[PDB]
Design an enzyme around this catalytic site. Structure first.
Site, PDB file in Angstrom:
ATOM      1  N   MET A  79       0.867  -1.159   0.000  1.00  0.00           N
ATOM      2  CA  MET A  79       0.000   0.000   0.000  1.00  0.00           C
ATOM      3  C   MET A  79       0.908   1.212   0.000  1.00  0.00           C
ATOM      4  SD  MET A  79      -3.191  -0.899   2.462  1.00  0.00           S
ATOM      5  CE  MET A  79      -2.028  -0.847   3.809  1.00  0.00           C
ATOM      6  N   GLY A  80       2.012   1.114   0.721  1.00  0.00           N
ATOM      7  CA  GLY A  80       2.958   2.189   0.746  1.00  0.00           C
ATOM      8  C   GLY A  80       4.144   2.000   1.661  1.00  0.00           C
ATOM      9  N   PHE A 110      10.319   4.765   8.091  1.00  0.00           N
ATOM     10  CA  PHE A 110      11.284   3.694   8.262  1.00  0.00           C
ATOM     11  C   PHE A 110      10.631   2.346   8.129  1.00  0.00           C
ATOM     12  CE2 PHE A 110      12.698   7.288  10.923  1.00  0.00           C
ATOM     13  CZ  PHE A 110      13.671   7.722  10.054  1.00  0.00           C
ATOM     14  N   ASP A 126       6.875  15.039  13.847  1.00  0.00           N
ATOM     15  CA  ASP A 126       6.788  14.772  12.414  1.00  0.00           C
ATOM     16  C   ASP A 126       5.350  14.933  11.886  1.00  0.00           C
ATOM     17  OD1 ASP A 126       7.922  14.350   9.895  1.00  0.00           O
ATOM     18  OD2 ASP A 126       8.203  12.191  10.155  1.00  0.00           O
ATOM     19  N   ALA A 136       1.358  13.119   5.220  1.00  0.00           N
ATOM     20  CA  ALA A 136       1.620  11.680   5.088  1.00  0.00           C
ATOM     21  C   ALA A 136       1.359  10.974   6.441  1.00  0.00           C
ATOM     22  CB  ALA A 136       3.075  11.442   4.662  1.00  0.00           C
TER      23      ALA A 136
HETATM   24  C1  LIG Z   1      -5.648   3.313   0.137  1.00  0.00           C
HETATM   25  N1  LIG Z   1      -4.819   3.097   1.310  1.00  0.00           N
HETATM   26  C2  LIG Z   1      -5.289   2.643   2.501  1.00  0.00           C
HETATM   27  C3  LIG Z   1      -4.193   2.595   3.324  1.00  0.00           C
HETATM   28  N2  LIG Z   1      -4.246   2.239   4.632  1.00  0.00           N
HETATM   29  C4  LIG Z   1      -3.289   2.527   5.596  1.00  0.00           C
HETATM   30  N3  LIG Z   1      -2.150   3.119   5.211  1.00  0.00           N
HETATM   31  C5  LIG Z   1      -1.188   3.380   6.125  1.00  0.00           C
HETATM   32  N4  LIG Z   1       0.026   3.996   5.746  1.00  0.00           N
HETATM   33  C6  LIG Z   1       0.232   4.388   4.337  1.00  0.00           C
HETATM   34  C7  LIG Z   1      -0.531   5.604   3.908  1.00  0.00           C
HETATM   35  C8  LIG Z   1       1.626   4.201   3.752  1.00  0.00           C
HETATM   36  C9  LIG Z   1       0.498   3.338   3.270  1.00  0.00           C
HETATM   37  C10 LIG Z   1      -1.366   3.071   7.460  1.00  0.00           C
HETATM   38  N5  LIG Z   1      -0.421   3.359   8.386  1.00  0.00           N
HETATM   39  C11 LIG Z   1      -0.679   3.063   9.682  1.00  0.00           C
HETATM   40  C12 LIG Z   1       0.368   3.399  10.675  1.00  0.00           C
HETATM   41  C13 LIG Z   1       1.720   3.075  10.209  1.00  0.00           C
HETATM   42  N6  LIG Z   1       2.787   2.815   9.830  1.00  0.00           N
HETATM   43  C14 LIG Z   1      -1.864   2.492  10.106  1.00  0.00           C
HETATM   44  C15 LIG Z   1      -2.822   2.200   9.139  1.00  0.00           C
HETATM   45  C16 LIG Z   1      -2.603   2.480   7.790  1.00  0.00           C
HETATM   46  N7  LIG Z   1      -3.544   2.178   6.873  1.00  0.00           N
HETATM   47  C17 LIG Z   1      -3.108   3.044   2.545  1.00  0.00           C
HETATM   48  N8  LIG Z   1      -3.499   3.350   1.303  1.00  0.00           N
END
Ligand SMILES: Cn1cc(Nc2nc(NC3(C)CC3)c3nc(CC#N)ccc3n2)cn1
Length: 279
Positions: free
Chosen positions: A29-30, A34, A138, A142
């Site tokens: 997803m991303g 770190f 931070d 994002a």
């Molecule tokens: C469509 N789409 C849904 C998501 N869902 C998502 N994305 C998280 N981080 C991202 C934005 C880098 C990918 C995320 N991060 C944390 C905490 C941390 N690390 C807790 C939950 C999270 N849920 C990403 N894209």
């Protein structure tokens, strides 16, 4: 409180950490603080798996345990099997504010109504941290995640700290307060960074862009004060429901947050109050 995982479990939930896009068939997803984040599963709950440094893993769990609020992301679990480390949260279906402002992967632009709720929610999350004597360090778009109802959730307390100076300057430079870039650790620096987020919400522009004048979004504040431009010139054109009054009211909060002198900035409680008066 949190459920203790084992690496095999997480390897499998993530389809062996398929580190590739969702469009294709992967799980990535991303990537961010770190680490990398892939979509995972635990019975009925979809989880976010943060595959990673150790001190940032240790602190995240420390901060997360004492800080539970509807505007903070919720940690469900983690795994500490060796040098490979993992953090597990409630998966945020609408990802980050950064990605939704840029309409990454073809998501529709956020309306002004939705943008106002996100700004208030993010201010409420920062307020909770400041009340609990925590400095985020931070604050950026994002690190503002969006749930199933587009409710803002502050994430990434790896750099968080419970006036005080440091040798290791950390943060995202496009969002950092002048005093933070000089080594000062103060909740007043989180206010400045939140001011940059508010400019991102109004304009839909990234905090920094090489191919832009000015390169730094925080510099549009000067253009406006010098009357080389108006806020109206910068309002995100990907909205049909912005009205000058509330936009100027949010800009006024952003402008105050971005004061060069830390003591002249409003505290989070004044920010929260001002954002509530806006609606
Ligand atoms: C469509 N789409 C849904 C998501 N869902 C998502 N994305 C998280 N981080 C991202 C934005 C880098 C990918 C995320 N991060 C944390 C905490 C941390 N690390 C807790 C939950 C999270 N849920 C990403 N894209």
């Amino acid at each position: 409180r949190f459920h203790s995982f084992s690496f095999y479990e997480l390897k499998n939930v993530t389809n062996n950490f398929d580190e590739r896009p969702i469009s294709v068939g992967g799980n990535k997803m991303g990537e961010g603080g770190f680490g990398v984040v892939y979509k995972g599963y635990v019975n009925n709950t979809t989880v976010a798996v943060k595959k990673l440094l150790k001190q940032q893993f240790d602190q995240e769990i420390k901060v997360m345990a004492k800080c539970q609020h509807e505007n903070l992301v919720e940690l469900l679990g983690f795994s500490s099997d060796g040098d490979d480390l993992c953090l597990v949260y409630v998966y945020m279906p609408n990802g980050s504010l950064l990605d939704r402002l840029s309409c990454l992967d073809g998501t529709p632009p956020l309306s002004w109504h939705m943008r106002c709720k996100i700004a208030q929610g993010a201010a409420n999350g920062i307020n909770f941290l400041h009340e609990n004597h925590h400095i985020h360090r931070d604050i950026k778009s994002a690190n503002i995640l969006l749930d199933e109802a587009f409710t803002a959730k502050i994430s990434d307390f790896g750099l968080a700290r419970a006036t005080v100076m440091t040798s290791r300057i950390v943060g995202t430079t496009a969002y950092m307060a002048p005093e933070a870039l000089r080594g000062e650790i103060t909740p007043k620096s989180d206010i400045y960074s939140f001011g940059v987020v508010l400019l991102e919400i109004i304009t839909g522009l990234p905090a920094v862009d090489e191919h832009r004048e000015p390169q730094l979004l925080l510099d549009i504040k000067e253009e406006i004060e010098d009357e080389e431009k108006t806020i109206e010139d910068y309002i995100d054109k990907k909205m049909n429901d912005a009205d000058s009054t509330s936009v100027e009211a949010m800009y006024s909060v952003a402008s105050q947050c971005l004061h060069e002198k830390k003591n002249k900035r409003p505290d989070i409680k004044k920010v929260q109050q001002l954002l509530q008066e806006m609606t």
